């Protein structure tokens, strides 16, 4: 199954959850490929990839090379395909390359048809570029990552999500009355809300600094257990 993870806004924890969900699927005995579709190229850093390692699927395409030679093996069950490092000029001119990357959809379509992986997780950026909509079309299911706050609450009433997307709460915290009011409102009104959420957790803040997925960094962390619950739900509902 091809699963897209995309934040309803930036910074809600999409990348950390993607790496963690991939680790949990492996722990459940699954073969997983993780693809970084974000030009920030941060997913690789949850997998001990050196910051100076610039290779990636988009870096390869723009250099006229085979994107299939830019993948990395993390474990025997978990492969990683970083986006690649863009130069400052490329970062500040997305219109130069956001249309040159259409071959990745064909390439991921072949990979999907081969059944080489049981799961392909795509970390998708918060934009509406051509390449982002193209990768979303390959997904069989999608998760919309939110935080429970007034910002996300407004966005759910005005911006479109992928069809059939389910909403996943991250960063649930103690000490916020307004968050609890919004959350209780969501429990009665948001039809596509997932029955489990992820709390704010020190392990989720440290695992990126240790360059590991949270399940590998602290297997008994509460957030690691919450992600494992999500992985079990995906096995049952997103197969």
């Amino acid at each position: 199954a091809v699963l897209g993870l995309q934040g309803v806004r930036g910074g809600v924890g999409t990348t950390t959850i993607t790496a963690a969900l991939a680790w949990s699927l492996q722990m459940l005995g699954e073969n997983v490929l993780v693809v970084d579709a974000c030009p920030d190229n941060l997913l690789r850093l949850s997998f001990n990839v050196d910051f100076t390692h610039r290779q990636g699927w988009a870096r390869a395409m723009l250099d006229g090379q085979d994107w299939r030679d830019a993948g990395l093996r993390y474990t025997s069950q978990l492969d990683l395909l970083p986006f690649g490092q863009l130069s400052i000029e490329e970062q500040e001119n997305p219109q130069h390359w956001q249309t040159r990357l259409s071959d990745i959809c064909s390439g991921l379509q072949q990979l999907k048809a081969s059944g080489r992986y049981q799961w392909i997780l795509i970390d998708l950026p918060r934009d509406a570029s051509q390449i982002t909509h193209q990768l979303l079309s390959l997904c069989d299911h999608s998760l919309a990552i939110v935080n429970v706050d007034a910002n996300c609450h407004i966005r759910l009433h005005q911006q479109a999500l992928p069809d059939g997307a389910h909403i996943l709460i991250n960063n649930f915290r103690i000490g916020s009355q307004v968050q609890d009011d919004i959350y209780q409102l969501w429990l009665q009104s948001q039809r596509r809300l997932l029955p489990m959420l992820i709390h704010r957790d020190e392990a989720m803040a440290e695992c990126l600094a240790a360059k590991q997925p949270v399940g590998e960094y602290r297997s008994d962390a509460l957030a690691a257990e919450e992600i494992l619950t999500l992985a079990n739900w995906c096995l049952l509902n997103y197969s």
Partner: protein, 39 residues
């Protein structure tokens, strides 16, 4: 509808059953933003 074809829709939100829970009535009372979308 992006053209494989990927369609985009607003999140499925249903506010019909709000008035049941009294705790939701107090939350809508305090926060005008939530009451604005609810009604």
């Amino acid at each position: 509808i992006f053209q494989l074809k990927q369609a985009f829709s607003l999140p499925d939100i249903d506010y019909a059953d709000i008035s049941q829970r009294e705790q939701l009535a107090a939350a809508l009372k305090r926060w005008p933003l939530l009451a604005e979308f609810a009604q």
